[PDB]
Design a protein around this ligand. Structure first.
Ligand code: MG
Lengths: 134, 50, 134
C-alpha cells in the first residue's frame, strides 16, 4: 500500500541486503538538494506555461517527494509533446502535398481531355470528307 | 513510462516511498526532537531502529 | 448524509477492521501538506484563466477538503478540454478536406461535360454529311 507495483518487485532483483549507500543513494538534507528541488519546481512552473507540461503532470510533480521521479516527469512530458508536434508538422506537410497531388492529377486530366477532344474533331473531319466523295 | 526510468531511479523511488510514509506515520521529527534534549544534557544522542 | 455514494461503499471491502495508517493514509499538519494546498489552489487559478478549468469545477475545489480529491478534479477537466480541442481540430481538418473534395468533383463535372459536349457536335456533324450524300 505504501509502495508501487515496480517498487515492490525491486526485492527480487538481488542484493537488497546491501546498504543503499553502496548502490549510490544517500539520505541528504543539505543545501544541494533543496537548491535542486527549488530549481526543479521553478523549471516545472516555467514549463507549465508555454504549454510544455500538462496540468496532469504538474500535480504529479507536487506529490512526488523524490527528486528523480519529478525529474523523469519533466523528461517524459517533453518527449511526448515534441513527438506530437513533430508528427503534426509531418501530417500538415503531406496534407498540402496531397492537395498539390490532387490539383496536379486533375489538370493533367484537363490536359489529357483537350487532346482527346481535339483528335475526335480531326478524325470526324476525315469522315465528313469521306461520305460526300462517294 | 518505466522504460525511461533507470535502475538507480527505481531504487530511489522505493527508498523515498518508505521514508516519506514512516516519517509522517510515526511523527519522526518529534522523536529526533526529544533526542536533541539528551544531546544538550548528556552529550549523547542515541536511537535504535528495530 | 455526511458521506458520498462511493465513501459508504469501502465498508463492503475487507479492510476497515485495520488502521488507516496501514493503507497509506495519515493525518498531517506540516509544512508539506500546507504547501500542497497552496500549490493546488494556485494551479487551479492559473487553470481557471486561459480557459482550462470551468467555473463549476472551481466551486468544487473550494469545497473539497481533500488534497487528493482536488488533484483528481483538475486532472478530470483538463482531460475534458484536451479531447474537445483535439476533436475540433480534426473536425476543422476534415471540413477543409471535404470542401476540397466537393470542389474537386465539380470541376471534373466541368471536365466530363465538355468531352461529352464536343463529341455530340461531332456525331451530329456526321449525320449532316450522310444526309447530303443521298
Ligand atoms: Mg450530504
Amino acid at each position: 500500500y505504501i509502495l508501487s507495483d515496480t517498487s515492490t518487485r525491486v526485492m527480487e532483483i538481488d542484493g537488497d541486503e546491501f546498504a543503499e549507500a553502496d548502490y549510490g543513494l544517500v539520505v541528504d538534507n543539505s543545501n544541494g538538494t533543496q537548491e535542486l528541488q527549488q530549481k526543479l519546481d521553478t523549471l516545472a512552473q516555467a514549463a507549465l506555461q508555454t504549454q510544455t507540461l500538462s496540468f496532469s503532470t504538474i500535480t504529479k510533480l507536487y506529490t512526488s517527494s523524490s527528486l528523480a521521479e519529478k525529474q523523469r516527469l519533466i523528461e517524459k512530458d517533453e518527449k511526448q509533446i515534441r513527438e506530437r508536434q513533430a508528427q503534426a508538422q509531418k501530417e500538415q506537410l503531406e496534407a498540402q502535398q496531397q492537395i498539390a497531388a490532387m490539383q496536379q492529377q486533375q489538370k493533367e486530366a484537363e490536359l489529357l481531355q483537350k487532346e482527346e477532344a481535339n483528335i475526335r474533331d480531326n478524325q470526324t473531319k476525315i469522315i465528313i470528307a469521306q461520305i460526300q466523295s462517294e | 513510462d518505466y522504460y525511461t526510468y533507470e535502475w538507480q531511479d527505481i531504487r530511489e523511488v522505493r527508498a523515498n516511498e518508505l521514508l516519506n510514509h514512516y516519517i509522517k506515520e510515526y511523527d519522526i521529527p518529534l522523536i529526533f526532537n526529544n533526542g536533541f534534549m539528551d544531546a544538550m544534557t548528556c552529550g549523547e544522542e542515541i536511537y535504535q531502529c528495530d
